[PDB]
Design a protein around this ligand. Structure first.
Ligand SMILES: Nc1nc2c(ncn2[C@@H]2O[C@H](COP(=O)(O)OP(=O)(O)OP(=O)(O)O)[C@@H](O)[C@H]2O)c(=O)[nH]1
Ligand SMILES: [Ca+2]
Ligand SMILES: [Mg+2]
Ligand SMILES: [Mg+2]
Lengths: 51, 439
Protein backbone atom coordinates (compact mmCIF):
# COMPACT_ATOMS: atom_id res chain seq x y z
CA UNK A 1 0.00 0.00 0.00
CA UNK A 2 2.87 2.42 0.64
CA UNK A 3 4.19 1.75 -2.86
CA UNK A 4 0.66 2.18 -4.26
CA UNK A 5 0.39 5.51 -2.45
CA UNK A 6 3.75 6.63 -3.87
CA UNK A 7 2.45 5.86 -7.39
CA UNK A 8 -0.65 7.87 -6.55
CA UNK A 9 1.34 10.84 -5.29
CA UNK A 10 3.40 10.85 -8.50
CA UNK A 11 0.33 10.66 -10.73
CA UNK A 12 -1.23 13.54 -8.77
CA UNK A 13 1.89 15.69 -9.23
CA UNK A 14 1.70 14.83 -12.94
CA UNK A 15 -1.95 15.81 -13.36
CA UNK A 16 -1.22 19.02 -11.44
CA UNK A 17 1.62 19.86 -13.84
CA UNK A 18 -0.66 19.22 -16.82
CA UNK A 19 -3.31 21.40 -15.20
CA UNK A 20 -0.78 24.23 -15.07
CA UNK A 21 -0.14 23.63 -18.78
CA UNK A 22 -3.87 23.94 -19.55
CA UNK A 23 -4.11 27.26 -17.75
CA UNK A 24 -1.06 28.59 -19.63
CA UNK A 25 -2.75 27.50 -22.87
CA UNK A 26 -5.80 29.49 -21.75
CA UNK A 27 -3.67 32.57 -20.96
CA UNK A 28 -1.96 32.49 -24.36
CA UNK A 29 -5.18 32.46 -26.40
CA UNK A 30 -6.92 35.04 -24.22
CA UNK A 31 -3.78 37.18 -24.63
CA UNK A 32 -4.07 36.95 -28.43
CA UNK A 33 -7.76 37.84 -28.24
CA UNK A 34 -6.98 40.79 -25.98
CA UNK A 35 -4.32 42.14 -28.32
CA UNK A 36 -6.38 41.78 -31.51
CA UNK A 37 -9.27 43.59 -29.75
CA UNK A 38 -6.97 46.34 -28.50
CA UNK A 39 -5.61 46.84 -32.00
CA UNK A 40 -9.17 47.21 -33.33
CA UNK A 41 -10.17 49.57 -30.51
CA UNK A 42 -7.01 51.68 -30.87
CA UNK A 43 -7.46 52.01 -34.63
CA UNK A 44 -11.14 52.88 -34.23
CA UNK A 45 -10.34 55.61 -31.69
CA UNK A 46 -7.46 57.18 -33.64
CA UNK A 47 -9.58 57.27 -36.79
CA UNK A 48 -12.48 58.91 -34.92
CA UNK A 49 -10.17 61.47 -33.31
CA UNK A 50 -8.44 62.41 -36.56
CA UNK A 51 -11.70 62.66 -38.49
CA UNK B 1 1.37 -40.26 0.72
CA UNK B 2 1.83 -36.48 0.91
CA UNK B 3 0.94 -34.12 -1.93
CA UNK B 4 3.08 -31.54 -3.76
CA UNK B 5 1.67 -28.49 -5.55
CA UNK B 6 3.64 -27.09 -8.50
CA UNK B 7 3.44 -23.37 -9.31
CA UNK B 8 4.66 -21.90 -12.60
CA UNK B 9 5.09 -18.12 -12.81
CA UNK B 10 5.94 -16.06 -15.89
CA UNK B 11 6.92 -17.16 -19.37
CA UNK B 12 9.93 -19.31 -18.43
CA UNK B 13 8.18 -21.05 -15.52
CA UNK B 14 5.07 -21.79 -17.63
CA UNK B 15 6.87 -23.00 -20.75
CA UNK B 16 9.26 -25.11 -18.64
CA UNK B 17 6.26 -26.33 -16.63
CA UNK B 18 4.68 -27.43 -19.89
CA UNK B 19 7.70 -29.52 -20.77
CA UNK B 20 7.92 -31.15 -17.30
CA UNK B 21 4.28 -32.26 -17.12
CA UNK B 22 4.52 -33.64 -20.66
CA UNK B 23 7.52 -35.61 -19.40
CA UNK B 24 5.82 -36.65 -16.16
CA UNK B 25 2.88 -38.04 -18.16
CA UNK B 26 5.23 -40.06 -20.37
CA UNK B 27 7.19 -41.40 -17.38
CA UNK B 28 3.97 -42.52 -15.64
CA UNK B 29 2.06 -43.75 -18.69
CA UNK B 30 -0.65 -41.06 -18.48
CA UNK B 31 -2.27 -40.27 -21.83
CA UNK B 32 -2.91 -36.67 -22.93
CA UNK B 33 -6.62 -37.01 -22.05
CA UNK B 34 -5.60 -37.74 -18.44
CA UNK B 35 -6.36 -41.47 -18.55
CA UNK B 36 -3.86 -43.87 -16.97
CA UNK B 37 -4.38 -47.54 -17.96
CA UNK B 38 -1.73 -48.72 -15.43
CA UNK B 39 -3.71 -47.29 -12.50
CA UNK B 40 -6.20 -49.90 -11.31
CA UNK B 41 -7.73 -47.80 -8.46
CA UNK B 42 -10.21 -45.64 -10.39
CA UNK B 43 -10.83 -42.15 -9.03
CA UNK B 44 -8.50 -42.35 -6.05
CA UNK B 45 -5.40 -43.82 -4.50
CA UNK B 46 -2.35 -42.87 -2.51
CA UNK B 47 0.36 -44.22 -4.76
CA UNK B 48 3.60 -42.29 -5.20
CA UNK B 49 2.50 -40.69 -8.45
CA UNK B 50 -0.51 -39.24 -6.57
CA UNK B 51 1.90 -36.77 -4.97
CA UNK B 52 1.78 -34.87 -8.30
CA UNK B 53 -1.59 -36.05 -9.73
CA UNK B 54 -5.08 -36.19 -8.29
CA UNK B 55 -7.85 -38.34 -9.83
CA UNK B 56 -11.42 -37.75 -10.96
CA UNK B 57 -14.21 -40.30 -10.83
CA UNK B 58 -13.92 -40.50 -14.62
CA UNK B 59 -10.37 -41.80 -14.13
CA UNK B 60 -8.59 -38.59 -15.18
CA UNK B 61 -5.23 -37.83 -13.56
CA UNK B 62 -4.98 -34.08 -12.96
CA UNK B 63 -1.69 -32.26 -12.22
CA UNK B 64 -1.51 -30.58 -8.82
CA UNK B 65 -0.35 -27.55 -10.75
CA UNK B 66 -1.13 -23.86 -11.16
CA UNK B 67 0.10 -21.74 -14.10
CA UNK B 68 0.27 -17.96 -13.62
CA UNK B 69 1.34 -15.29 -16.11
CA UNK B 70 0.44 -11.57 -16.18
CA UNK B 71 -0.12 -11.95 -19.92
CA UNK B 72 -2.30 -14.55 -21.65
CA UNK B 73 -0.31 -15.61 -24.70
CA UNK B 74 1.94 -18.25 -23.10
CA UNK B 75 -0.71 -19.87 -20.92
CA UNK B 76 -3.02 -19.89 -23.95
CA UNK B 77 -0.63 -22.39 -25.53
CA UNK B 78 -1.41 -24.67 -22.60
CA UNK B 79 -5.19 -24.16 -22.90
CA UNK B 80 -5.01 -25.08 -26.61
CA UNK B 81 -1.98 -27.38 -26.54
CA UNK B 82 -1.47 -31.14 -26.53
CA UNK B 83 -2.66 -31.51 -22.93
CA UNK B 84 -5.61 -29.10 -22.87
CA UNK B 85 -7.63 -31.99 -21.42
CA UNK B 86 -5.15 -32.52 -18.58
CA UNK B 87 -5.69 -29.20 -16.82
CA UNK B 88 -8.83 -27.47 -15.90
CA UNK B 89 -9.53 -23.76 -16.46
CA UNK B 90 -9.21 -22.80 -12.78
CA UNK B 91 -5.51 -23.84 -12.85
CA UNK B 92 -4.56 -21.47 -15.69
CA UNK B 93 -4.45 -17.87 -14.52
CA UNK B 94 -3.70 -14.99 -16.88
CA UNK B 95 -3.75 -11.27 -16.25
CA UNK B 96 -4.19 -8.57 -18.87
CA UNK B 97 -0.86 -6.76 -19.24
CA UNK B 98 2.52 -8.06 -18.18
CA UNK B 99 5.23 -6.64 -15.94
CA UNK B 100 7.33 -5.18 -18.79
CA UNK B 101 10.60 -6.80 -17.60
CA UNK B 102 10.22 -4.76 -14.41
CA UNK B 103 10.46 -6.42 -10.97
CA UNK B 104 8.73 -3.47 -9.31
CA UNK B 105 5.77 -3.62 -11.70
CA UNK B 106 5.42 -7.38 -11.30
CA UNK B 107 5.76 -7.16 -7.51
CA UNK B 108 4.00 -3.95 -6.45
CA UNK B 109 1.78 -2.60 -9.23
CA UNK B 110 0.33 -5.70 -10.89
CA UNK B 111 1.08 -8.19 -8.11
CA UNK B 112 -1.23 -6.39 -5.67
CA UNK B 113 -4.04 -6.72 -8.22
CA UNK B 114 -3.72 -10.48 -8.80
CA UNK B 115 -2.17 -12.09 -5.69
CA UNK B 116 -5.47 -12.82 -3.91
CA UNK B 117 -6.83 -14.58 -6.98
CA UNK B 118 -3.71 -16.74 -7.38
CA UNK B 119 -3.75 -17.62 -3.68
CA UNK B 120 -7.42 -18.53 -3.93
CA UNK B 121 -6.82 -20.94 -6.82
CA UNK B 122 -3.89 -22.53 -4.95
CA UNK B 123 -6.21 -22.89 -1.95
CA UNK B 124 -8.59 -24.92 -4.11
CA UNK B 125 -5.72 -27.34 -4.77
CA UNK B 126 -4.52 -27.44 -1.16
CA UNK B 127 -8.06 -28.32 -0.02
CA UNK B 128 -7.91 -31.52 -2.10
CA UNK B 129 -4.69 -32.54 -0.29
CA UNK B 130 -4.91 -34.82 2.73
CA UNK B 131 -1.32 -33.96 3.71
CA UNK B 132 0.27 -31.15 1.71
CA UNK B 133 4.07 -31.10 1.84
CA UNK B 134 4.47 -27.74 0.16
CA UNK B 135 5.33 -26.20 -3.15
CA UNK B 136 7.65 -26.38 -6.14
CA UNK B 137 7.99 -22.96 -7.76
CA UNK B 138 9.24 -22.56 -11.35
CA UNK B 139 10.26 -19.11 -12.52
CA UNK B 140 12.90 -16.95 -14.18
CA UNK B 141 15.18 -14.70 -12.16
CA UNK B 142 15.01 -12.16 -14.93
CA UNK B 143 11.44 -11.59 -16.03
CA UNK B 144 9.24 -8.89 -14.54
CA UNK B 145 6.64 -11.50 -13.55
CA UNK B 146 9.03 -14.35 -12.80
CA UNK B 147 11.04 -12.09 -10.53
CA UNK B 148 8.51 -9.60 -9.14
CA UNK B 149 5.37 -11.68 -8.73
CA UNK B 150 7.17 -14.85 -7.60
CA UNK B 151 8.71 -13.00 -4.66
CA UNK B 152 5.32 -11.62 -3.56
CA UNK B 153 3.77 -15.08 -3.85
CA UNK B 154 6.58 -16.73 -1.85
CA UNK B 155 6.11 -14.19 0.96
CA UNK B 156 2.37 -14.87 0.99
CA UNK B 157 2.93 -18.64 0.86
CA UNK B 158 5.05 -18.42 4.03
CA UNK B 159 2.11 -16.60 5.63
CA UNK B 160 -0.73 -18.88 4.46
CA UNK B 161 1.27 -22.16 4.65
CA UNK B 162 3.83 -21.50 7.35
CA UNK B 163 4.72 -25.11 8.04
CA UNK B 164 5.08 -26.10 4.36
CA UNK B 165 8.32 -26.48 2.44
CA UNK B 166 9.03 -24.49 -0.71
CA UNK B 167 11.46 -25.55 -3.42
CA UNK B 168 12.49 -23.37 -6.36
CA UNK B 169 13.66 -24.11 -9.89
CA UNK B 170 15.05 -20.74 -11.00
CA UNK B 171 16.21 -19.79 -14.50
CA UNK B 172 19.30 -17.62 -14.14
CA UNK B 173 19.71 -15.05 -16.96
CA UNK B 174 22.13 -15.42 -19.82
CA UNK B 175 22.49 -12.96 -22.71
CA UNK B 176 22.71 -15.87 -25.19
CA UNK B 177 19.01 -16.56 -24.49
CA UNK B 178 17.13 -13.29 -25.03
CA UNK B 179 17.44 -11.24 -21.79
CA UNK B 180 16.23 -7.80 -20.76
CA UNK B 181 19.03 -5.36 -19.99
CA UNK B 182 17.60 -4.92 -16.47
CA UNK B 183 17.67 -8.65 -15.62
CA UNK B 184 20.57 -8.15 -13.14
CA UNK B 185 18.35 -5.74 -11.17
CA UNK B 186 15.36 -8.13 -11.23
CA UNK B 187 17.56 -11.08 -10.25
CA UNK B 188 19.07 -9.37 -7.20
CA UNK B 189 15.73 -7.86 -6.15
CA UNK B 190 13.95 -11.23 -6.17
CA UNK B 191 16.75 -13.24 -4.54
CA UNK B 192 16.80 -10.73 -1.68
CA UNK B 193 13.02 -10.90 -1.25
CA UNK B 194 12.75 -14.69 -1.64
CA UNK B 195 15.88 -15.80 0.24
CA UNK B 196 14.26 -16.44 3.61
CA UNK B 197 11.10 -17.96 2.13
CA UNK B 198 12.71 -20.70 0.04
CA UNK B 199 14.04 -23.88 1.63
CA UNK B 200 16.04 -25.06 -1.38
CA UNK B 201 16.61 -23.50 -4.81
CA UNK B 202 17.96 -25.15 -7.97
CA UNK B 203 19.42 -22.48 -10.25
CA UNK B 204 19.59 -23.31 -13.94
CA UNK B 205 21.77 -20.98 -16.00
CA UNK B 206 20.42 -20.57 -19.56
CA UNK B 207 24.04 -20.20 -20.68
CA UNK B 208 24.79 -23.73 -19.48
CA UNK B 209 21.65 -25.25 -21.06
CA UNK B 210 22.28 -23.33 -24.29
CA UNK B 211 25.86 -24.61 -24.54
CA UNK B 212 24.91 -28.20 -23.75
CA UNK B 213 22.34 -27.92 -26.55
CA UNK B 214 25.01 -26.66 -28.96
CA UNK B 215 27.82 -29.02 -27.92
CA UNK B 216 26.07 -32.35 -27.22
CA UNK B 217 22.93 -32.08 -29.37
CA UNK B 218 24.76 -30.15 -32.12
CA UNK B 219 21.84 -27.78 -32.47
CA UNK B 220 23.32 -24.64 -33.98
CA UNK B 221 20.83 -22.14 -32.50
CA UNK B 222 18.69 -23.91 -29.88
CA UNK B 223 15.04 -22.93 -29.42
CA UNK B 224 13.10 -22.53 -26.17
CA UNK B 225 11.68 -26.00 -26.86
CA UNK B 226 15.19 -27.44 -27.09
CA UNK B 227 16.21 -25.64 -23.91
CA UNK B 228 13.06 -26.57 -22.00
CA UNK B 229 13.09 -30.23 -22.91
CA UNK B 230 16.62 -30.57 -21.53
CA UNK B 231 15.69 -28.57 -18.41
CA UNK B 232 12.64 -30.81 -17.92
CA UNK B 233 14.85 -33.88 -18.01
CA UNK B 234 16.93 -32.43 -15.19
CA UNK B 235 13.87 -31.31 -13.24
CA UNK B 236 12.35 -34.76 -13.65
CA UNK B 237 15.60 -36.31 -12.37
CA UNK B 238 15.36 -34.05 -9.32
CA UNK B 239 11.65 -34.71 -8.61
CA UNK B 240 11.55 -38.46 -9.46
CA UNK B 241 12.07 -39.39 -5.79
CA UNK B 242 8.78 -37.62 -4.93
CA UNK B 243 6.79 -39.50 -7.61
CA UNK B 244 8.23 -43.07 -7.47
CA UNK B 245 8.88 -45.69 -4.82
CA UNK B 246 12.19 -45.21 -3.04
CA UNK B 247 13.82 -44.15 0.17
CA UNK B 248 15.95 -41.10 -0.77
CA UNK B 249 14.53 -37.54 -0.96
CA UNK B 250 11.01 -38.93 -0.62
CA UNK B 251 9.53 -35.66 0.70
CA UNK B 252 10.42 -31.98 0.42
CA UNK B 253 11.89 -31.82 3.92
CA UNK B 254 14.57 -34.37 2.98
CA UNK B 255 15.87 -32.08 0.24
CA UNK B 256 16.73 -29.55 2.93
CA UNK B 257 18.05 -32.21 5.33
CA UNK B 258 20.27 -33.79 2.67
CA UNK B 259 21.40 -30.73 0.73
CA UNK B 260 21.23 -27.65 2.96
CA UNK B 261 23.09 -27.58 6.32
CA UNK B 262 22.95 -23.75 6.40
CA UNK B 263 19.55 -22.22 5.51
CA UNK B 264 20.94 -19.28 3.44
CA UNK B 265 23.39 -21.43 1.45
CA UNK B 266 20.49 -23.33 -0.10
CA UNK B 267 21.43 -23.36 -3.82
CA UNK B 268 22.67 -26.82 -4.85
CA UNK B 269 24.59 -27.27 -8.06
CA UNK B 270 23.02 -29.75 -10.47
CA UNK B 271 25.15 -31.71 -12.95
CA UNK B 272 23.55 -34.03 -15.47
CA UNK B 273 24.81 -36.79 -17.78
CA UNK B 274 24.69 -38.05 -20.41
CA UNK B 275 23.11 -35.74 -22.97
CA UNK B 276 23.15 -37.53 -26.35
CA UNK B 277 21.89 -36.35 -29.74
CA UNK B 278 19.03 -38.44 -31.09
CA UNK B 279 20.06 -37.97 -34.72
CA UNK B 280 23.35 -39.62 -33.71
CA UNK B 281 22.72 -43.09 -35.15
CA UNK B 282 25.04 -45.45 -33.24
CA UNK B 283 26.49 -44.17 -29.96
CA UNK B 284 28.32 -46.21 -27.36
CA UNK B 285 26.37 -46.52 -24.12
CA UNK B 286 28.23 -44.72 -21.31
CA UNK B 287 29.08 -46.80 -18.23
CA UNK B 288 28.37 -46.03 -14.57
CA UNK B 289 31.97 -44.90 -14.10
CA UNK B 290 31.84 -42.59 -17.13
CA UNK B 291 28.51 -40.85 -16.37
CA UNK B 292 29.56 -40.50 -12.73
CA UNK B 293 32.90 -39.05 -13.81
CA UNK B 294 31.03 -36.63 -16.11
CA UNK B 295 29.32 -35.27 -12.97
CA UNK B 296 32.60 -33.53 -12.09
CA UNK B 297 32.94 -31.94 -15.55
CA UNK B 298 31.95 -28.23 -15.48
CA UNK B 299 30.70 -28.65 -19.06
CA UNK B 300 27.81 -30.79 -17.67
CA UNK B 301 26.77 -28.47 -14.82
CA UNK B 302 23.54 -26.43 -14.76
CA UNK B 303 25.60 -23.38 -13.72
CA UNK B 304 29.12 -22.93 -15.06
CA UNK B 305 31.64 -22.62 -12.22
CA UNK B 306 34.65 -24.47 -10.84
CA UNK B 307 33.88 -26.75 -7.85
CA UNK B 308 37.62 -27.48 -7.40
CA UNK B 309 37.90 -23.93 -6.10
CA UNK B 310 35.28 -24.35 -3.39
CA UNK B 311 34.15 -26.85 -0.78
CA UNK B 312 31.33 -29.36 -0.68
CA UNK B 313 28.74 -29.46 2.05
CA UNK B 314 26.55 -32.27 0.68
CA UNK B 315 26.30 -34.46 -2.40
CA UNK B 316 23.49 -36.63 -3.76
CA UNK B 317 23.80 -38.90 -6.79
CA UNK B 318 20.49 -39.65 -8.56
CA UNK B 319 20.72 -42.46 -11.13
CA UNK B 320 18.09 -43.60 -13.60
CA UNK B 321 18.35 -46.87 -15.48
CA UNK B 322 20.59 -49.90 -15.38
CA UNK B 323 22.72 -49.15 -12.32
CA UNK B 324 23.60 -51.23 -9.25
CA UNK B 325 25.32 -50.06 -6.04
CA UNK B 326 28.48 -52.10 -6.75
CA UNK B 327 29.21 -50.05 -9.89
CA UNK B 328 28.51 -46.75 -8.11
CA UNK B 329 31.03 -47.41 -5.36
CA UNK B 330 33.64 -48.62 -7.83
CA UNK B 331 33.19 -45.41 -9.83
CA UNK B 332 33.29 -43.25 -6.69
CA UNK B 333 36.47 -44.89 -5.39
CA UNK B 334 38.19 -44.27 -8.74
CA UNK B 335 36.97 -40.68 -8.88
CA UNK B 336 38.16 -39.86 -5.34
CA UNK B 337 41.78 -40.54 -6.34
CA UNK B 338 41.75 -38.41 -9.51
CA UNK B 339 39.34 -35.51 -8.92
CA UNK B 340 39.78 -32.60 -6.50
CA UNK B 341 36.86 -33.07 -4.08
CA UNK B 342 37.14 -31.10 -0.81
CA UNK B 343 34.37 -31.13 1.78
CA UNK B 344 34.19 -28.58 4.56
CA UNK B 345 35.73 -29.87 7.77
CA UNK B 346 32.43 -29.99 9.69
CA UNK B 347 30.76 -32.37 7.19
CA UNK B 348 31.13 -36.04 6.25
CA UNK B 349 32.89 -36.67 2.95
CA UNK B 350 30.31 -38.91 1.35
CA UNK B 351 27.51 -39.40 -1.13
CA UNK B 352 23.86 -40.21 -0.71
CA UNK B 353 22.90 -42.40 -3.69
CA UNK B 354 19.48 -43.10 -5.15
CA UNK B 355 18.80 -45.47 -8.06
CA UNK B 356 15.58 -45.84 -10.05
CA UNK B 357 15.82 -48.77 -12.42
CA UNK B 358 13.58 -47.21 -15.10
CA UNK B 359 15.89 -45.48 -17.63
CA UNK B 360 15.07 -41.86 -18.47
CA UNK B 361 12.08 -41.17 -20.66
CA UNK B 362 12.57 -38.90 -23.65
CA UNK B 363 9.93 -37.10 -25.69
CA UNK B 364 9.25 -38.90 -29.00
CA UNK B 365 10.63 -36.74 -31.78
CA UNK B 366 12.78 -34.65 -29.46
CA UNK B 367 16.51 -34.11 -29.83
CA UNK B 368 17.60 -36.30 -26.90
CA UNK B 369 18.34 -39.96 -27.49
CA UNK B 370 17.28 -42.70 -25.10
CA UNK B 371 20.13 -43.85 -22.88
CA UNK B 372 20.33 -46.96 -20.74
CA UNK B 373 21.60 -45.01 -17.71
CA UNK B 374 21.90 -41.39 -16.58
CA UNK B 375 22.73 -39.55 -13.38
CA UNK B 376 21.95 -36.18 -11.85
CA UNK B 377 24.37 -35.03 -9.17
CA UNK B 378 23.11 -32.47 -6.64
CA UNK B 379 26.01 -30.96 -4.73
CA UNK B 380 25.98 -28.01 -2.35
CA UNK B 381 29.35 -26.46 -3.22
CA UNK B 382 30.48 -22.94 -2.46
CA UNK B 383 31.68 -22.67 -6.07
CA UNK B 384 28.15 -21.71 -7.15
CA UNK B 385 28.79 -18.32 -5.56
CA UNK B 386 30.67 -17.45 -8.78
CA UNK B 387 27.21 -17.10 -10.32
CA UNK B 388 26.22 -14.59 -7.63
CA UNK B 389 29.48 -12.66 -8.00
CA UNK B 390 28.96 -12.36 -11.77
CA UNK B 391 25.38 -11.13 -11.35
CA UNK B 392 26.32 -8.84 -8.48
CA UNK B 393 29.03 -7.26 -10.64
CA UNK B 394 26.68 -6.41 -13.50
CA UNK B 395 24.22 -4.94 -10.98
CA UNK B 396 26.97 -2.69 -9.59
CA UNK B 397 27.98 -1.35 -13.01
CA UNK B 398 24.43 -0.21 -13.80
CA UNK B 399 23.47 0.92 -10.31
CA UNK B 400 26.57 3.12 -9.96
CA UNK B 401 24.90 5.35 -12.61
CA UNK B 402 21.34 4.62 -11.42
CA UNK B 403 20.68 3.44 -14.97
CA UNK B 404 17.03 2.41 -15.46
CA UNK B 405 16.29 2.90 -11.77
CA UNK B 406 13.52 5.40 -12.58
CA UNK B 407 11.39 2.62 -14.10
CA UNK B 408 11.40 0.93 -10.69
CA UNK B 409 10.79 4.03 -8.57
CA UNK B 410 7.94 5.03 -10.89
CA UNK B 411 6.08 1.87 -9.88
CA UNK B 412 6.27 2.84 -6.21
CA UNK B 413 9.54 1.16 -5.24
CA UNK B 414 11.98 3.07 -3.06
CA UNK B 415 15.55 3.38 -4.33
CA UNK B 416 16.63 2.05 -0.92
CA UNK B 417 15.35 -1.40 -1.82
CA UNK B 418 18.13 -1.70 -4.42
CA UNK B 419 20.73 -1.11 -1.70
CA UNK B 420 18.93 -3.40 0.75
CA UNK B 421 18.87 -6.15 -1.86
CA UNK B 422 22.46 -5.63 -2.94
CA UNK B 423 23.74 -5.64 0.64
CA UNK B 424 21.96 -8.95 1.25
CA UNK B 425 23.77 -10.41 -1.76
CA UNK B 426 27.05 -9.04 -0.40
CA UNK B 427 26.50 -10.90 2.85
CA UNK B 428 25.55 -13.94 0.80
CA UNK B 429 28.81 -13.79 -1.13
CA UNK B 430 30.78 -13.53 2.08
CA UNK B 431 28.89 -16.39 3.72
CA UNK B 432 30.05 -18.52 0.81
CA UNK B 433 33.65 -17.31 1.11
CA UNK B 434 33.74 -18.00 4.86
CA UNK B 435 32.46 -21.53 4.28
CA UNK B 436 34.62 -22.51 1.35
CA UNK B 437 37.94 -20.66 1.30
CA UNK B 438 40.89 -20.33 3.66
CA UNK B 439 43.33 -17.41 3.87
N1 LIG C 1 15.10 -21.71 -20.28
C1 LIG C 1 14.10 -20.88 -20.61
N2 LIG C 1 14.23 -19.55 -20.35
C2 LIG C 1 13.24 -18.69 -20.67
C3 LIG C 1 12.07 -19.12 -21.29
N3 LIG C 1 11.29 -18.02 -21.48
C4 LIG C 1 11.95 -16.94 -21.00
N4 LIG C 1 13.17 -17.34 -20.53
C5 LIG C 1 14.19 -16.51 -19.88
O1 LIG C 1 13.50 -15.84 -18.82
C6 LIG C 1 13.96 -14.49 -18.69
C7 LIG C 1 12.86 -13.52 -19.07
O2 LIG C 1 11.79 -13.65 -18.19
P1 LIG C 1 10.37 -14.24 -18.65
O3 LIG C 1 9.95 -15.45 -17.77
O4 LIG C 1 10.27 -14.48 -20.14
O5 LIG C 1 9.47 -12.94 -18.39
P2 LIG C 1 8.16 -12.97 -17.50
O6 LIG C 1 8.35 -13.70 -16.21
O7 LIG C 1 7.06 -13.53 -18.31
O8 LIG C 1 7.93 -11.45 -17.05
P3 LIG C 1 7.38 -10.28 -18.00
O9 LIG C 1 7.19 -10.73 -19.44
O10 LIG C 1 8.36 -9.14 -17.85
O11 LIG C 1 6.04 -9.94 -17.38
C8 LIG C 1 15.05 -14.31 -19.71
O12 LIG C 1 16.28 -14.54 -19.04
C9 LIG C 1 14.75 -15.40 -20.73
O13 LIG C 1 15.92 -15.78 -21.39
C10 LIG C 1 11.92 -20.48 -21.54
O14 LIG C 1 10.89 -20.97 -22.06
N5 LIG C 1 12.95 -21.34 -21.20
CA1 LIG D 1 -5.53 -44.57 -8.58
MG1 LIG E 1 5.96 -12.57 -19.98
MG1 LIG F 1 -2.12 -37.45 1.48
Amino acid sequence: EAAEERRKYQEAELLKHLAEKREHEREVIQKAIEENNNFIKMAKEKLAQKM
Amino acid sequence: MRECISIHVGQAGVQIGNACWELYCLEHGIQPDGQMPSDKTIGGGDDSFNTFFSETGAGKHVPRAVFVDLEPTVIDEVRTGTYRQLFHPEQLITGKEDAANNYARGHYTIGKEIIDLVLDRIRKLADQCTGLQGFLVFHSFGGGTGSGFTSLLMERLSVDYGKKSKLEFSIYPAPQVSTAVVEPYNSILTTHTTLEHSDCAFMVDNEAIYDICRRNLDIERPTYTNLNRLISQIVSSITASLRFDGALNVDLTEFQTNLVPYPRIHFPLATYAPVISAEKAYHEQLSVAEITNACFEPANQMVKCDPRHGKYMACCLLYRGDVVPKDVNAAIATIKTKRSIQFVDWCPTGFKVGINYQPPTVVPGGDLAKVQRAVCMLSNTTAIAEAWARLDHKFDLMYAKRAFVHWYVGEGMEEGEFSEAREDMAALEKDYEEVGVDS
